[PDB]
Design a protein around this motif. Structure first.
Motif, mmCIF file in Angstrom:
data_model
loop_
_atom_site.group_PDB
_atom_site.id
_atom_site.type_symbol
_atom_site.label_atom_id
_atom_site.label_comp_id
_atom_site.label_asym_id
_atom_site.label_seq_id
_atom_site.Cartn_x
_atom_site.Cartn_y
_atom_site.Cartn_z
ATOM 1 N N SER A 57 -16.341 -9.103 -48.361
ATOM 2 C CA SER A 57 -16.103 -10.230 -49.257
ATOM 3 C C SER A 57 -15.913 -11.456 -48.379
ATOM 4 C CB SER A 57 -14.822 -9.997 -50.049
ATOM 5 O OG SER A 57 -14.412 -11.165 -50.739
ATOM 6 N N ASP A 58 -16.327 -12.630 -48.870
ATOM 7 C CA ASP A 58 -16.038 -13.861 -48.139
ATOM 8 C C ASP A 58 -14.717 -14.510 -48.550
ATOM 9 O OD1 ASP A 58 -16.595 -15.377 -50.477
ATOM 10 O OD2 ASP A 58 -18.619 -15.893 -49.823
ATOM 11 N N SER A 59 -13.936 -13.869 -49.422
ATOM 12 C CA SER A 59 -12.750 -14.484 -50.030
ATOM 13 C C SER A 59 -11.470 -14.019 -49.337
ATOM 14 C CB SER A 59 -12.722 -14.161 -51.506
ATOM 15 O OG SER A 59 -11.524 -14.619 -52.110
ATOM 16 N N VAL A 112 -20.001 -8.047 -51.861
ATOM 17 C CA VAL A 112 -19.735 -8.520 -53.215
ATOM 18 C C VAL A 112 -19.541 -10.033 -53.210
ATOM 19 C CG1 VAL A 112 -18.741 -6.330 -53.908
ATOM 20 C CG2 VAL A 112 -17.207 -8.161 -53.143
ATOM 21 N N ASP A 113 -19.816 -10.647 -54.365
ATOM 22 C CA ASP A 113 -19.561 -12.078 -54.534
ATOM 23 C C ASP A 113 -19.447 -12.417 -56.015
ATOM 24 O OD1 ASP A 113 -19.008 -14.706 -53.668
ATOM 25 O OD2 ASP A 113 -21.090 -15.216 -53.300
ATOM 26 N N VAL A 114 -18.754 -13.532 -56.268
ATOM 27 C CA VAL A 114 -18.590 -14.111 -57.592
ATOM 28 C C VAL A 114 -19.622 -15.210 -57.779
ATOM 29 C CG1 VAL A 114 -16.916 -15.901 -56.926
ATOM 30 C CG2 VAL A 114 -16.862 -14.998 -59.216
ATOM 31 N N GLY A 115 -19.986 -15.440 -59.032
ATOM 32 C CA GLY A 115 -20.730 -16.624 -59.409
ATOM 33 C C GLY A 115 -20.040 -17.240 -60.605
ATOM 34 N N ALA A 166 -24.577 -10.964 -51.241
ATOM 35 C CA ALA A 166 -24.379 -10.943 -52.685
ATOM 36 C C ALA A 166 -24.291 -12.341 -53.298
ATOM 37 C CB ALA A 166 -23.095 -10.181 -53.010
ATOM 38 N N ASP A 167 -24.485 -13.391 -52.507
ATOM 39 C CA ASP A 167 -24.269 -14.740 -53.006
ATOM 40 C C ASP A 167 -25.209 -15.054 -54.162
ATOM 41 O OD1 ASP A 167 -23.101 -17.409 -52.839
ATOM 42 O OD2 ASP A 167 -25.084 -18.012 -52.125
ATOM 43 N N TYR A 168 -24.764 -15.953 -55.044
ATOM 44 C CA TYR A 168 -25.576 -16.386 -56.177
ATOM 45 C C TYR A 168 -26.512 -17.553 -55.868
ATOM 46 C CZ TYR A 168 -23.497 -13.130 -59.381
ATOM 47 O OH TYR A 168 -23.104 -11.974 -60.019
ATOM 48 N N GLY A 169 -26.425 -18.155 -54.687
ATOM 49 C CA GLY A 169 -27.352 -19.222 -54.350
ATOM 50 C C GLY A 169 -27.123 -20.516 -55.099
HETATM 51 MG MG MG Z 1 -21.163 -17.223 -53.118
#
Ligand code: MG
Ligand code: K
Ligand code: MG
Length: 135
Positions: free
Chosen positions: A71-73, A10-13, A131-134
């Motif tokens: 998650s990376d968070s 999962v990731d946020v943008g 899941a990153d938004y780039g």
């Molecule tokens: Mg990201």
RNA sequence: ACAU
DNA sequence: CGATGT
């Protein structure tokens, strides 16, 4: 050490922080998008990271899946562990929607059980989370 | 410092 | 460069 490929990432943008917040969950192995949240007009990066993990927990529980979540968070992982999102974001009329979702996510954690491992994605060794938004 |  | 977090 090793990526667990049988997992959900999962990731946020966001556009601004605080700013417009969205999040998504993907199959780590293939990158298939499994869920995406409609953009929320004002929130923080960490609130979005938190919501993304909780949504993943709910998604996997509903499907009887024992996969872990990446998650990376560091922050969001701890907030989920504590069942408490310690956000500094002002609670006012413009932040009401994100705070409603965060409050509801905490409420879900306090009324449901799960065994899902919540794992730190090791960006320094593995690159960006799938899941990153780039941006 | 570390994680975003 | 600025902001969110432990
Ligand atoms: Mg990201
Ligand atoms: K991005
Ligand atoms: Mg992230």
């Amino acid at each position: 050490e090793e990526i667990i490929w049988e997992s959900l990432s999962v990731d946020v943008g966001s556009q601004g922080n605080p700013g417009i917040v969205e999040y998504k969950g993907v199959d780590t192995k293939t990158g298939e998008v499994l869920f995406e949240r409609e953009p929320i007009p004002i929130g923080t990066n960490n609130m979005g990271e938190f919501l993304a993990i909780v949504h993943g927990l709910r998604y996997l529980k509903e499907r009887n899946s024992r996969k872990p979540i990446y998650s990376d968070s560091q922050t969001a992982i701890k907030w989920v562990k504590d069942k408490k999102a310690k956000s500094t974001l002002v609670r006012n009329e413009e932040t009401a929607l994100i705070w409603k979702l965060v409050d509801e996510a905490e409420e879900w954690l306090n009324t449901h059980t799960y065994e899902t491992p919540i794992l730190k994605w090791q960006t320094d060794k593995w690159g960006e989370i799938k899941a990153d938004y780039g941006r």
